[PDB]
Amino acid sequence: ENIEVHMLNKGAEGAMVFEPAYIKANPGDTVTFIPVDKGHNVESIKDMIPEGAEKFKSKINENYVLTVTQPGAYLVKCTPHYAMGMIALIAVGDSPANLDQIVSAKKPKIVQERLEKVIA
C-alpha cells in the first residue's frame, strides 16, 4: 500500500513539517513524499535507519517515492530544515528493534522535541 506525506512550510506542529510525521508501514509498502511547498526534500539520517536498509536522499522539490523493505524504525529529515525540526518517523513492522536507539541518539533539541511528540 502507499502512504502519502506532504512537505510543508507550516503545519499543525509549527514551521517546517512533514504531515504525517509518524508513518506506519509494512515491508513492500511505498511512502510518497509530496513537496506541497517548495524548498524541501527527504533524506535518511545516518545510523537512524535499520541495519541493512539503503541510505536515500531525494532532490529538493521533487515528488519522491520510497519503497520500504527492512523492518525497524527510520528517522528521515528534510536536509535544509533538519535543524528547524523537519523530520518524520517511519515504523516498519511491529516493535521496531531500533526505536529506543533512535530516541536516544544525538540530534537537535527541536528535533528531539518533535520526535517525542510524534512517538506519543
Ligand SMILES: [Cu+2]
Ligand atoms: Cu524542508
